[PDB]
Design an enzyme around this catalytic site. Structure first.
Site, short mmCIF file in Angstrom:
data_model
loop_
_atom_site.label_atom_id
_atom_site.label_comp_id
_atom_site.label_asym_id
_atom_site.label_seq_id
_atom_site.Cartn_x
_atom_site.Cartn_y
_atom_site.Cartn_z
N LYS C 86 -4.66 0.39 4.12
CA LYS C 86 -4.64 -0.12 5.49
C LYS C 86 -6.02 -0.42 6.04
O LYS C 86 -6.22 -1.37 6.79
CB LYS C 86 -3.92 0.87 6.40
N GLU C 108 0.53 -0.65 15.93
CA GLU C 108 1.75 0.12 15.68
C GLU C 108 1.55 0.81 14.34
O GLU C 108 0.75 0.35 13.52
CB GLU C 108 2.96 -0.81 15.62
N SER C 376 -1.30 2.77 -3.30
CA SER C 376 -1.68 2.41 -1.94
C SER C 376 -2.30 3.48 -1.05
O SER C 376 -3.04 3.15 -0.13
CB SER C 376 -0.48 1.78 -1.22
C1 LIG Z 1 -0.02 4.53 1.78
C2 LIG Z 1 0.86 3.42 2.17
N1 LIG Z 1 1.45 2.64 1.23
C3 LIG Z 1 2.29 1.67 1.59
C4 LIG Z 1 2.74 1.44 2.97
C5 LIG Z 1 3.53 0.14 3.13
O1 LIG Z 1 3.14 -0.83 4.12
P1 LIG Z 1 2.95 -2.09 3.46
O2 LIG Z 1 2.66 -3.14 4.36
O3 LIG Z 1 4.17 -2.58 2.91
O4 LIG Z 1 1.96 -2.25 2.46
C6 LIG Z 1 2.14 2.16 4.04
C7 LIG Z 1 2.42 1.90 5.39
C8 LIG Z 1 2.34 2.64 6.57
C9 LIG Z 1 2.73 2.26 7.91
N2 LIG Z 1 3.77 1.67 8.16
C10 LIG Z 1 1.67 2.42 8.87
O5 LIG Z 1 0.83 3.46 8.62
O6 LIG Z 1 1.40 1.66 9.81
C11 LIG Z 1 1.23 3.24 3.64
O7 LIG Z 1 0.64 4.06 4.49
#
Ligand SMILES: Cc1ncc(COP(=O)(O)O)c(/C=C/C(=N)C(=O)O)c1O
Ligand SMILES: Cc1ncc(COP(=O)(O)O)c(/C=C/C(=N)C(=O)O)c1O
Ligand code: NA
Ligand code: NA
Lengths: 393, 251, 393, 251
Positions: C86, C108, C376
């Site tokens: 992220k 969010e 991730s």
């Molecule tokens: C570690 C991690 N891996 C995958 C996902 C998937 O989100 P993607 O867009 O599909 O890649 C999140 C997502 C976390 C949340 N919804 C948030 O923290 O905001 C993660 O925190």
């Protein structure tokens, strides 16, 4: 008879029961051999780079030094796999254990970082592993307790004495006295009997080596001073080592002042203790007039230790490195400051180093100085403690 | 001096030795003194007394508890030396050995510690966390004050260690749980005593037959103390029984 | 009228109230400009390298593939500052906000990782920041809630609807509808109205770019397949992007199967949903026959989302990428397996990707295949949940 | 067709319009029907009815609660259309507009949705999350079924938007809270109605003087509903008062 010098001036040695000397001599020989083996170095480098994530970044603070002539960089050991610098040397010690033919691993831990590091290394390299941890730390550092267990490591709470690092250490030694044939004692700091102080330093020295290369690349000159917290002394000596021969670079170690040196509730034996013999070494100790070991205190579990590594005691004695202390409150303020101004949550241990750097800056805001603070670990493990405190306020 | 006279007398009687071990000030100053007098009454040839240390990183839970008790009684190294003087005043010939941790010896100066030992009447000192490799200042101070430096011969010992222990030690050689007695004698080592795991009369007998001058019983005695904790008057008789039921195995 | 195509085949678009179109057009123009500005790229690269810690390692598993012909590498986004991928795009979006002149930040979050990333970026770059988080996630991901607050971010629990990601999203949009003049809405996934799907991909594409360079350096060839979990789609598209034109490389996205697709309690709209219009885009949605949005479910908070990014829906439609699902139990087994065999604690989100890679390996153990799983994020935030579950068992 | 006749009649009377808004099925099917009849009795020139959507990401808490209530009553789009048919059967001339969310229109086919609207007697449809940029299929289907596509003219609108809204919209132009009426008329835009924040008679008056054909009162009516929740018989009279006390401000 040893291959390497067990002493740093008057400090160090191998003050262990005769039964453990063969284990220490074997470990010293294995280490010397490994240090000369290009194959061992390549494997170690491979793990550090591709598994642990080295090299770690050297981050320039661009908000906390505003309005001053201080330029501050943070060596990011918080970005290492595991969340702390502990991971570096456990990988090396784990490879040594295998080189010797050991299949089990014994370790002690305070902030739980060395425990998690020992557990992750053992899981990766196929070694068994049991960790001793003070019951008090089991509680204030609960996050690492879970992590250790998830990785298949046996976590053993120690309720003896002050129920902290010191007590976990005692147990690990008692355990190794009876299981040293199939298990390698993976000591987690630059302390204890020779060769540990030397091995830990050599397996942590990449911190300083990278810092030197990165600061030269970014500033074109060495730091005016490098600053690190000192519990047992591993992250600090790791940062210091490569700069020892660079006389212009100040080496500053920060011991925990706890509730204040004058309260007697602290963990600063190097400057406020007395030389003694304990945990296999001759080094500064917090002790009674009678020679009993005193219990230490710090808001930070990783710094709650009544002694300190022998090389730090030596570097201090000759004036090469300077040691200071930082209280619980000063470390807490540094913690909050880094979170809010740089978006980095530091371990409370590391916060003591940062706190002193902030003091160097705030005390003489017009003094031009380039400083490097070793951010030994991330503060996710301290999130609940800092909150439970900032709440009372 | 006392160990020499002892073994000399124990040799003219074709017998070995039985050395019991206990922690000073445990479970208290008064009870401790009474415990030791009982030990000597039963048949203790010599004594091995431990001084309570805050972090006995070389002792099992058994001894750890004992220290805790002593500390719970406010026992300190100073009071231990007060006790040793009292024990010596009552029993002039029995060899008294101390089991120390390095820091308690190094604390107020190594030389000063051994001086206090000589002053009070102690005969030997075994420092648990000081291998022969680091023993120099300790054994030298001991010898200067007529105190015998006791060294432990571990089960994983080698020839090199045997020769050092043989020449550095005095009083007796502490053996950790047949040929190992051959070398020591060849090197002229202080009368060897087998320890660790020695909790039965037969173990003592086999030790003498092996070539040992006697046998030291570690926690064997301490294990008895704690099991009769709530009953002082029982503990004493319990100890009298064992000791006598052990020294006989050396005749 | 737009500078870039808002659609991926039939999916995408800008389905927002007319009042928000100026904000989206301004954002698209700023993005296009920034992408051409070498100064912006240099600043972004600097932050990624020296603050976030890029590049991240590509780790070869050496225990989990034993006895099979599968070679598995894990792209270590868990080693990025913040603990998840992220962080990459928040730094870019934060720089965009500043480029436009915005001083506030709205965001969010589900697993709390995007929230923490938004907060840390805002603290570093001098921006205000408020985060919306489903009340359910506030509880099962509590560790990130603390971190967010420590960094000066306002955490706002959302009790509406299912009290999860979807609901937090709705609030963030309602909020931006009234505060879009001084605040930039930092959407956290490759979804929502154009240009977000495009911006998020471009600001996350370094994941795939580095992976390609690292795998070529280590294996001398491209992977047979890259695998990533898909909540909104950011980490997966970040991994996929640079390999889209490499037709030989399979692209596998893993949606959460929850308690099982047949139970209706899952978060796999791409394969088991129906195209609809919601959250500013036309994309696969979990919905009733009536067209109401269904509430999704997953043991993983970060994957608990009833929709999916438009580019994934498009890549699936044309057959370029394949999507599968993994249940709570399969993800939990992968989590335990990685902890015990490689010493890495993965986020439960990432565990879904790993779980599928393990299935590809276990199902055909003699099939020679080189796989890359996008790890991730780290699983420190899931430590209490996994324990509270493994306990019931 | 009905909006045209309305404004035409409202122009021959030198007056504006007052359009109230309410959610269908809130707080229930029966109470909702009675609410709307009351609204028309008081003076509602036209109606703007919302269909409960699961995730109204464009409505404040006020409307969110209303939807919740409807869902709590098991209200569905289908039952809403059953209601619209009943309302139309009782009131043949009053213009009825629907406030929809894109997915509820797109769900079973856009064309099919507008067909149902024509079938039941609906006059216009405003899709909250469909800007003119994405309106093509929607307005085209609306026009094919004689339904007026309503477009919102935001406060941050520009000339480009004004021209599009003017040519794409029918029935009336929804204005968000003087010169902005000049352009619309110049471009021949559907009779402009001011909305958002319109909760007082004076606001309605100033809107007509500004050049608007009338004014729409958003939650102004909904705010009254909820405040008299526990009292159905009170809510109705409460609403009668306001409506009449608003339409008068348009004459
Ligand atoms: C570690 C991690 N891996 C995958 C996902 C998937 O989100 P993607 O867009 O599909 O890649 C999140 C997502 C976390 C949340 N919804 C948030 O923290 O905001 C993660 O925190
Ligand atoms: C993050 C961190 N920083 C510093 C220290 C200090 O130990 P040093 O040797 O002095 O470097 C520890 C130490 C933690 C433990 N005692 C343990 O986890 O084990 C840390 O976990
Ligand atoms: Na210390
Ligand atoms: Na999804």
């Amino acid at each position: 008879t040893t291959l390497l010098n067990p002493y740093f001036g008057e400090f160090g040695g191998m003050y262990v029961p005769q039964i453990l000397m063969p284990a220490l001599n074997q470990l010293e020989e294995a280490f010397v051999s490994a240090q000369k083996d290009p194959e061992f170095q390549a494997q170690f480098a491979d793990l550090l780079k591709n598994y642990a994530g080295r090299p770690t970044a050297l981050t320039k603070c661009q908000n906390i030094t505003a309005g001053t002539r201080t330029t501050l960089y943070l060596k990011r050991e918080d970005l290492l796999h595991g969340g702390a610098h502990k991971t570096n040397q456990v990988l090396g010690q784990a490879l040594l254990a295998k080189r010797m033919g050991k299949s089990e691993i014994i370790a002690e831990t305070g902030a739980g970082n060395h425990g998690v590091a020992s557990a992750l290394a053992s899981a990766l390299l196929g070694l068994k592993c049991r960790i001793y941890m003070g019951a008090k730390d089991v509680e204030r550092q609960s996050p690492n307790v879970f992590r250790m267990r998830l990785m298949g490591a046996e976590v053993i709470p120690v309720h003896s004495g002050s129920a902290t690092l010191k007590d976990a250490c005692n147990e690990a030694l008692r355990d190794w006295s009876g299981s040293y044939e199939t298990a390698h004692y993976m000591l987690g700091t630059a302390a204890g009997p020779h060769p540990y102080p030397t091995i830990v330093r050599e397996f942590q020295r990449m911190i300083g080596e990278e810092t030197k290369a990165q600061i030269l690349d970014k500033e074109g000159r060495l730091p005016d001073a490098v600053i690190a917290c000192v519990g047992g002394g591993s992250n600090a000596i790791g940062m210091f080592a490569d700069f020892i021969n660079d006389t212009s670079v100040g080496l500053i170690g920060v011991e925990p002042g706890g509730h204040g040196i004058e309260t007697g509730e602290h963990g600063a034996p190097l400057k406020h203790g007395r030389v003694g013999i304990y945990f296999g070494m001759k080094a500064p100790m917090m002790q009674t007039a009678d020679g009993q070991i005193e219990e230490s205190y710090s808001i930070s579990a990783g710094l709650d230790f009544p002694s300190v590594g022998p090389q730090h005691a030596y570097l201090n004695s000759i004036g090469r490195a300077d040691y200071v202390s930082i209280t619980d409150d000063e470390a807490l303020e540094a913690f909050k400051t880094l979170c809010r101004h740089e978006g980095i949550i530091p371990a409370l241990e590391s916060s003591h180093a940062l706190a002193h750097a902030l003091k160097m800056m705030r005390e003489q805001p017009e003094k031009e100085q380039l400083l490097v603070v070793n951010l030994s670990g991330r503060g996710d493990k301290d999130i609940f403690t800092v909150h439970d405190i900032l709440k009372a306020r | 001096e006392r160990y020499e006279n002892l073994f000399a007398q124990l040799n003219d009687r074709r017998e070995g030795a039985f050395v019991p071990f206990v922690t000073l000030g445990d479970p208290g100053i008064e009870q401790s003194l009474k415990i030791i007098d009982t030990l000597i009454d039963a048949g203790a040839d010599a004594l091995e007394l431990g001084v309570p240390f805050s972090d006995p990183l070389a002792d099992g839970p058994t001894i750890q508890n004992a220290n805790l008790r002593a500390f719970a009684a406010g026992v300190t190294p100073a009071q231990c030396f007060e006790m040793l003087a009292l024990i010596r005043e009552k029993h002039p010939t029995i060899p008294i050995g101390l089991l120390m941790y390095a820091n308690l010896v190094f604390n107020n100066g190594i030389d000063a510690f051994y001086a206090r030992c000589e002053q009070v009447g102690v005969d030997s000192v075994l420092v648990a966390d000081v291998p022969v490799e680091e023993s120099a200042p300790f054994r030298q101070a001991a010898l200067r004050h007529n105190i015998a430096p006791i060294f432990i011969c571990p089960p994983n010992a080698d020839d090199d260690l045997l020769r050092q222990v043989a020449s550095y030690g005095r009083g007796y050689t502490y053996l950790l749980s047949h040929h190992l007695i051959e070398k020591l004698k060849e090197y002229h080592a202080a009368p060897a005593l087998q320890g660790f795991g020695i909790s039965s009369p037969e173990q003592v007998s086999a030790a003498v037959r092996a070539g040992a001058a006697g046998a030291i019983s570690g926690s064997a005695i301490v294990k008895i103390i704690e099991k009769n904790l709530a009953s002082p008057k029982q503990m004493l008789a319990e100890l009298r029984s064992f000791v006598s039921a052990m020294k006989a195995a050396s005749r």
